[PDB]
């Protein structure tokens, strides 16, 4: 149950490499924007779910790269692809670390 600081991007109504592309296509079209508004939201990573809540069983994959900022990607379930934006890469990678044991928590 740790809390974080992020920026929001948007949502859609085999490996992680494919997930990055689907954002880059939906970004070059205009479905989801590149640079977000400065509005800072809390992304709490609890045992219950991603605290607007997301499951821990239905979640599949988390990706973080460098679009000196970063990006984020989820996979809840017809599939969903929730996209965010982190302050840096290290903190974006640090969120994965929480999911590494929160998965082993259930």
């Amino acid at each position: 149950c740790a809390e974080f600081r992020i920026k929001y991007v948007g949502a859609i109504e085999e490996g992680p490499l494919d997930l990055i592309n689907y954002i880059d296509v939906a970004q070059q079209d205009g479905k989801l924007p590149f640079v977000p508004p400065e509005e800072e939201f809390i992304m709490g990573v609890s045992k219950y779910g991603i605290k607007h809540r997301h499951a821990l069983y239905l979640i599949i994959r988390m990706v973080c790269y460098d679009d000196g900022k970063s990006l984020l990607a989820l996979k809840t379930t017809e599939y969903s692809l929730w996209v965010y934006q982190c302050n840096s890469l290290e903190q974006a990678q640090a969120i994965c670390k929480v999911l590494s044991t929160a998965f082993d928590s259930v």
Partner: peptide, 10 residues
């Protein structure tokens, strides 16, 4: 060292 990290659901 790393550049892009991920975690898969078992």
């Amino acid at each position: 060292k790393s550049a892009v990290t991920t975690v898969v659901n078992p």
